[PDB]
Amino acid sequence: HWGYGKHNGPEHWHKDFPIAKGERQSPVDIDTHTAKYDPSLKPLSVSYDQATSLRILNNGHAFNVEFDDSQDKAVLKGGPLDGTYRLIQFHFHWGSLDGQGSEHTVDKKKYAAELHLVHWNTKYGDFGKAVQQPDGLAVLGIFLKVGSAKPGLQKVVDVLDSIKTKGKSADFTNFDPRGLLPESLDYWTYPGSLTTPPLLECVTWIVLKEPISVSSEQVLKFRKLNFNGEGEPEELMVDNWRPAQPLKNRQIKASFK
Template structure:
């Protein structure tokens, strides 16, 4: 828990259990390092990206690193080092695919708390349509390295208020 966000970091035991991203606007293989959500105090200022000037209540970032580099840290400092998939969340119907993530909130209600998260497929967090916008940019949090190929999905996923 990071007070305004929380992050789930993948522990890579071997290449077979680590989700990867290939194709689309990127070349090579990118391994999932972590995902996190950004949200705000109100429904009109949670996402970090906008569409036609409008923000979503929340935005999910799935952070991947280019496996041609030996580590996430080294990849993050390279122009082609990271690929981040952004997914908007909208307030709507309950989303059973998010339930395992939401259930984890109970054990990480305060800053610095951690929990173990096993047997989870991050693909369940993606919408049905994988249409996207893409651009080369930077991390949205310090150190703001300009090493990110952004892939922002056009279709949001829903989450209920409760």
């Protein structure tokens, strides 16, 4: 099974999933000088007040927070998107040290970690059908930089020690995802893929310009998780990110000047 180690890492993924060498792979470096403004882009509309969190779990690749996506309760629309996209879950990527951690980069600069809020296109009826469509998913990427503590992240990090090993889960109710967003909704956007196997190129990427701030104490909690299952030799869950892929002619657009 794939992972982030030397023998099952990103350099190996292409063998089981050839698309790893596709034309629209993610993540990528965002060069502020070549990412131009696109007027056809509409205002980004994030509607999370109706969000119903269900649980939080460790799948061995990171930890996910899932939401009830049976109704158009927590949705994403506007921007470069068509119709509605329902939030289904969010997770993070981080490094072995504060200097690295994010997947995307801004003018070659990495942040301490990165947040991925995953949504699927409701026109495909179901998540399963969505991931297999070029425009099936919309992922809202948000950078995390070390500084002040993010009040809204407290609940998440406080539970981690209860799901240290791969396979552990726990009920996670009443979490409001709005507490993880920065002040500004300014963003960059491009067509790409999942940053992990099966690496399908079904993602419209929306990366926020403004990073949210999290304390050193908070990020360190992430590094307490384990890739491995209970009872197995500990393999700390750090550096669960994928190297940047070639842009290969795709255009990164910005919602601002």
